[PDB]
């Protein structure tokens, strides 16, 4: 719909043309070009809330989002008829598809996600450390279609895992082994976050240490 | 120290030329003759 | 039946043995009843738990790396390649009733043994429990130490869940093929092969049910052997003289309360086996070389090593031919601190001059500069910990990844310093916060003068008074002395009713009456031992 | 003492593994390396399915 375009174009003006320049360009070192990146890009970039973003810093981290969904199909058609690339995969509805992209299995998407890409995060989507500053966030708080155009379109630091290297069927794969390993409970007590031994020691010390001191103190007398 | 086998900017490289890849003689320990059968 | 069963059970232990006399010198021996001397039994009281959880996880563990799928209950695994420890470590995990319990508070025991060793450490250094009587007794304990470390690294990667393959990768394999002559031997010794040979594993299971355990029981069993017949030390107090033990017996009162803080020890253990996870190998995958996680990190015990090398500048030489990679510093690094921590009690024989028979305990602000360097040491290892835990203190405490390790870099270089000044100089500052309390008394509320318009903070002796308004200032004796009156016999007399209701007045009276009357009676036994040491 | 040590002291030196050159040692060859001639050495992808291709 050109309505829809347009929406796209009026919301376009008034919030980002100080960095993409108004002709979908990107202003130079103040904010990267944003032709061919897509309506996936865009949903997963305002989606999340990231990219009407305030600071060039580190890396722009996660907020709030700054549009809904009924706009954020209009910023991102806007966003593909000027450029072009990928798209967001849409359900019988024609609105944004989220619960079908969970795929048939999550071992493989187990395996896929700890081999391709849990370097970065950790084993169950908590966040990681990146080079200067940058950092790999927590995928708790990820809408199943975030995360596929998170793969899908890479935006800061993160490769773009395309069509191509990653098929739709391992892309499913993965957001079904994420959105079951971020949602699932931690087998056998509390989660000290989810990556191991620096939480449990530092649990074993305040928590377990201290009151095993405690007791002693209690115990034993002091002179 | 720094590793002495490093930073070298000579002209960067021809394109690699299309991968000719040789048979295999890691299999060639068998001879295919006219057949086997009966006869 | 039960009181003339136990006599003539007795007799006949009696009449096979003759047990009575060393047994009598078991327990009527004293130990002391501060503290402190508890911290290392926690040391002794989780080991125990460490073997019998230990032993049930021995029956259920099959080491390998025959690559076998999955084909049991985690769907998350089901199909993936993955070694045979990994596969019965998941059936321990998920099969067997009661599986994941043992081996978290097997795992929970191994931390609290391993940090109750730092903690005991910590005591013994402090408290100067390690000069000339005991100083193999620390030769030992730390070679314990030692093993317990080493032993512990085993333990979590018997598992080859990959985020401690990579711990093998880092540690175990990096820095023995980084050592310079013989490091490639000892790597191919270790392995049998490359990284993932095929008889890393059961060997680490070898070294790991028994043959560091057995040497970590062998020098348990000579260490308390050490600290049984070669009497404990103590603090000095008031009875308490170089060449006497004050304290409980151990069959009335210490065995009571040891055996009751073994039994809390475990529940503190339990409550944190299952109230808490830890190591989810099944969140984890099976070690694969070409996967990783993001934090990559060993245990807490050992996060000072690796740490030291996240920490270590990238310092390689290239000899003739060769290369010194960067894992021989560290290496050598864990070679230097270990050779500094057997051996700190002959170093600082040799600094000080300490070539006497010490048993009495010194308080550890009563020797500044040992207390110092021990906070270097402390704070050390803090900052190689706590740039070991670099990667999601960067994350989550937003950081630059380069900048924490940059202020771990520094910080390995200026914070012993930092720290060995406010250690040295807050230890002369305690030792000068008890030695005003002895010149004055100890501080209370403020009384003015009558006459004119003063304030005196009213401060209570704790010695001999003279006739005025200052006592007879006592000598220090490396006590703790009582900095408020609070501590004091001062106003410590509540309702001794219930929580909700009072009890009658003439029990009130008569409980307090008495009660007063025993602690009287017990410093006036103390008071008068102490007079029968010098008079 | 050398009985003990004996049966773990391998050679890393030994050379093990077919190479193109001939037999070199593990440190000096991946399954990068080529066996006897330049073939086809594909850098495939592996896309984590349990077992089939
Ligand atoms: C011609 C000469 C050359 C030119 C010189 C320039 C001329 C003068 C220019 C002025 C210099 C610029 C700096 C001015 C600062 C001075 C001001 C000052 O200190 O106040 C005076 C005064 C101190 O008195 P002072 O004049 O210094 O003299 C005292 C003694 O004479 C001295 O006390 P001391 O005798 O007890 O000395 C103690 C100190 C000796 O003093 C020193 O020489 C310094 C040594 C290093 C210092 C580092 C920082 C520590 C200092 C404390 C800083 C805390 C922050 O020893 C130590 O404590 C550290 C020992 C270092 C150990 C070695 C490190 C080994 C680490 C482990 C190695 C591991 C590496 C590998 C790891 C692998 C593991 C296997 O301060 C006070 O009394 C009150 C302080 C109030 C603070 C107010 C400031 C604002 C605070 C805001 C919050
Ligand atoms: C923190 C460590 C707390 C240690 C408690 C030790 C207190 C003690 O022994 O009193 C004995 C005292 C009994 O002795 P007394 O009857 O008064 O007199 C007997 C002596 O004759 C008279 O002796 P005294 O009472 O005059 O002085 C003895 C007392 C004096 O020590 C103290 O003043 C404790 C306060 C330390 C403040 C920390 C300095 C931070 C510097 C600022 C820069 C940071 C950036 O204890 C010590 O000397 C050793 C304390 C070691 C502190 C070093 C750790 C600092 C690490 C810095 C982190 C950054 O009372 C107790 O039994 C207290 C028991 C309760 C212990 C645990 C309570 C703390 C609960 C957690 C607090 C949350 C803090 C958050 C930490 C995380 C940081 C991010
Ligand atoms: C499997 C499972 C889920 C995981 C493994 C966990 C593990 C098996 C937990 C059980 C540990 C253990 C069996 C429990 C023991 C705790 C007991 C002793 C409760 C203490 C209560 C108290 C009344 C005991 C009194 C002690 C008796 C009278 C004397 C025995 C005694 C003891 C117990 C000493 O520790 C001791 C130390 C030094 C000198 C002498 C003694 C001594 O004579
Ligand atoms: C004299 C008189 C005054 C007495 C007082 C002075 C006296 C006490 C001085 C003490 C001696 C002094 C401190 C020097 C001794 C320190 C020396 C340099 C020994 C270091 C050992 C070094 C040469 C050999 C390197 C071998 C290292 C230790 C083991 C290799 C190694 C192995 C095998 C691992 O499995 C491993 C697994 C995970 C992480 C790391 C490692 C690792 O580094
Ligand atoms: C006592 C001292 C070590 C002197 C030894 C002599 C020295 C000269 C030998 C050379 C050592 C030097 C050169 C290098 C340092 C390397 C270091 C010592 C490695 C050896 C291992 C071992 C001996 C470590 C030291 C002992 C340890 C730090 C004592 C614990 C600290 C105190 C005194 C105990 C009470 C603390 C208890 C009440 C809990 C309080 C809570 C605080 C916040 C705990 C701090 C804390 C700790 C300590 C963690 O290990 C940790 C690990 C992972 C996550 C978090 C934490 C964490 O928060
Ligand atoms: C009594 C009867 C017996 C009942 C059993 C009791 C034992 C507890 C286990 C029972 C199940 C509960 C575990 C839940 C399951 C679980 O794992 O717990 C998560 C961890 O989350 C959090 O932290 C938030 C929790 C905050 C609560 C307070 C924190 C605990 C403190 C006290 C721990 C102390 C540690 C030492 C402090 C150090 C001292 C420093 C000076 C919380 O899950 P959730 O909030 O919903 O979502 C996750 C997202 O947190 C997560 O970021 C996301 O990534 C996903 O994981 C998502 O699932
Ligand atoms: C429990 C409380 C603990 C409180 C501790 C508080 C910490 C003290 C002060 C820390 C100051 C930190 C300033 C760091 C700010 C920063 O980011 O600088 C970075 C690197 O700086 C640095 O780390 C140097 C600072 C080092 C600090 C000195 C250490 C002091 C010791 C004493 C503190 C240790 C405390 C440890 C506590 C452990 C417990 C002990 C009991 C530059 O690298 P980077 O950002 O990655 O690269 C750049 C591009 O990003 C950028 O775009 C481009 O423009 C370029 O600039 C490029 O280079
Ligand atoms: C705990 C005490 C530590 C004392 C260490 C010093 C004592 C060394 C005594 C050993 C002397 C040599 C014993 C016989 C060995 C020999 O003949 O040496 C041949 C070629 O080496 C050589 O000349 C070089 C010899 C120099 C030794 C270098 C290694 C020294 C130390 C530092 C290595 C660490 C070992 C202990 C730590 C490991 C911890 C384990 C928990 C191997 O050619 P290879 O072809 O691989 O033959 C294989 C059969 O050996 C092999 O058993 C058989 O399994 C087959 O694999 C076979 O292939
Ligand atoms: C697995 C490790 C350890 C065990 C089982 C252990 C056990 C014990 C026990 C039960 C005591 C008597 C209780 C007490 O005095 O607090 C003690 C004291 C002692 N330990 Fe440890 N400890 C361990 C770690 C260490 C370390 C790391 C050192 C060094 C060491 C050296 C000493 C010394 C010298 C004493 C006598 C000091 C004293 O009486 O307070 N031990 N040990
Ligand atoms: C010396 C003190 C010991 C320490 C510090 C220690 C430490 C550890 C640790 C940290 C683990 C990993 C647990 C996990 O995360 O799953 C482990 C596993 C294991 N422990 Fe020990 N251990 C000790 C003694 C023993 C003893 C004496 C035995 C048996 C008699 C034993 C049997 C086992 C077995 C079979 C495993 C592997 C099974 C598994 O990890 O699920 N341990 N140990």
């Known amino acids: 719909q050109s309505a829809l375009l347009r929406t796209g174009k009026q919301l376009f003006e008034t919030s980002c043309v100080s960095c993409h320049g108004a002709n979908l360009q990107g202003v130079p070192d103040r904010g990267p070009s944003l032709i061919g990146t897509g309506e996936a890009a865009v949903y997963f970039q305002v989606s999340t809330g990231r990219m009407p973003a305030m600071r060039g810093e580190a890396q ?14 209009a910023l991102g058609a806007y966003v593909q008829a000027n450029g072009g690339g990928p798209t967001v995969p849409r359900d019988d509805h024609g609105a944004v598809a989220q619960e079908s992209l969970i795929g048939g299995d999550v071992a493989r998407g187990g395996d896929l996600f700890r081999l391709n890409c849990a370097s970065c995060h950790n084993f169950t989507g908590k966040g990681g450390a990146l080079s200067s500053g940058k950092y790999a966030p927590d995928l708790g708080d990820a809408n199943p279609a ?63 240490m201290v009151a095993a001191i405690g007791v002693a103190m209690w115990i034993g007398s002091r002179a | 120290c720094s590793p002495p086998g490093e930073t070298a900017s000579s002209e960067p490289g021809t394109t690699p030329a299309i991968w000719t890849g040789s048979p295999s003689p890691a299999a060639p320990s068998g001879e295919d003759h006219g057949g086997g059968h009966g006869a | 039946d039960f009181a003339k069963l136990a006599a003539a059970q007795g007799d006949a232990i009696d009449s096979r043995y003759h047990p009575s006399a060393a047994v009598r010198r078991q327990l009527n021996k004293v130990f002391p009843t501060h503290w402190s001397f508890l911290l290392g039994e926690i040391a002794l009281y989780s080991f125990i738990i460490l073997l019998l959880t230990g032993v049930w996880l021995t029956l259920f563990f099959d ?32 099969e067997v009733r009661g599986g994941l319990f043992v081996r978290q508070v097997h795992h929970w025991a191994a931390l609290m043994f391993a940090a109750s060793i730092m903690v005991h450490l910590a005591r013994i250094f402090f408290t100067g429990a390690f000069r000339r009587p005991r100083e193999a007794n620390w030769v030992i304990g730390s070679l314990l130490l030692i093993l317990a ?32 002559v013989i490091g490639t031997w000892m790597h191919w010794a270790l392995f049998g092969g490359d990284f993932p040979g095929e008889i890393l594993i059961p060997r680490l299971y070898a070294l790991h049910i028994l043959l560091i355990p057995g040497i970590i029981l062998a020098l348990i069993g000579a260490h308390l052997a050490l600290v049984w017949f070669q009497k404990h030390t103590q603090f000095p107090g008031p009875g308490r003289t170089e060449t006497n033990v004050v304290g409980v017996r151990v069959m009335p009162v210490f065995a009571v309360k040891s055996g009751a803080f073994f039994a809390m020890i475990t529940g503190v253990l339990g409550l944190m086996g299952g109230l808490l996870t830890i190591n989810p190998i099944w969140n984890l995958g099976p070690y694969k070389p070409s996967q990783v996680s993001a934090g990559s990190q060993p245990d807490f015990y050992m996060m000072w090593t690796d740490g030291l090398i996240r920490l270590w500048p990238a310092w390689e030489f290239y000899p003739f031919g060769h290369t010194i990679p960067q894992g021989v510093w560290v290496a050598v690094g864990m070679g230097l601190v270990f050779a500094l921590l057997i051996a700190y009690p002959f170093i600082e024989k040799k600094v000080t001059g300490d070539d006497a028979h010490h048993n009495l305990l010194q308080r550890p602000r009563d020797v500044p500069v040992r207390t110092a360097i021990g906070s270097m040491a402390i704070a050390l290892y803090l900052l190689l910990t706590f740039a070991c835990m670099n990667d999601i203190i960067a994350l989550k405490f937003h950081i630059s990844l380069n900048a924490t390790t940059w202020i771990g870099r ?6 012993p310093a930092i720290v060995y000044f406010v250690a040295y100089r807050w230890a002369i500052s305690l030792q000068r916060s008890d030695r005003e309390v002895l010149e004055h008394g100890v501080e209370t509320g403020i ?5 004119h318009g003063a304030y005196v903070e009213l401060h209570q002796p704790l010695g001999p008074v003279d006739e005025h308004g200052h006592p007879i200032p006592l ?47 017990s410093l006036t036994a103390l008071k008068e031992h102490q007079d029968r040491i010098h008079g | ?34 066996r006897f001639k330049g073939e086809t050495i594909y850098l495939a992808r592996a896309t984590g399915r349990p077992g089939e291709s």
């Open chain 3, 475 to 521: 000598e220090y004796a490396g006590a703790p002395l009582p900095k408020r009156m609070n501590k004091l016999g001062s106003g410590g007399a509540p309702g001794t009713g219930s929580f909700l209701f009072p009890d009658p007045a003439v029990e009130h009276e008569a409980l307090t009456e008495a009660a007063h009357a025993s602690e009287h009676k």
């Open chain 3, 447 to 451: 009384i003015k003068r009558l006459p």
């Open chain 3, 63 to 94: 080491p390998s790396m025959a690559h076998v799928t999955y084909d049991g209950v985690y769907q998350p695994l089901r199909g993936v390649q993955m070694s045979r420890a990994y596969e019965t470590a998941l059936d321990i995990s998920f």
């Open chain 3, 149 to 180: 470390m080493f032993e512990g690294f085993f333990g979590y990667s018997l598992p080859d869940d990959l985020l401690s393959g990579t711990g093998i990768r880092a540690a175990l394999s990096g820095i023995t093929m980084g050592i310079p």
């Open chain 1, 60 to 73: 722009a981290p996660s907020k709030p989002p700054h549009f809904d969904e009924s706009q954020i199909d």
């Open chain 3, 410 to 415: 520094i910080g390995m270089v200026v914070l």
């Open chain 1, 146 to 208: 975030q995360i596929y155009t998170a793969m899908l379109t890479g935006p800061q630091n993160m490769p773009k895992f395309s069509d191509r290297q990653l098929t739709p069927d391992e892309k499913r794969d993965i957001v079904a082994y994420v959105r079951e390993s971020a949602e699932t409970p931690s087998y056998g007590g509390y989660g000290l976050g989810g990556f191991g031994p620096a939480p449990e020691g530092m649990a074993m010390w305040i928590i377990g």
């Open chain 4, 1 to 34: 003492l050398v009985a003990f040590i004996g049966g773990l002291i391998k050679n890393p030196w030994k050379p093990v593994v077919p190479t193109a050159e001939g037999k070199k040692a593990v440190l000096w060859t991946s399954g990068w390396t080529p």
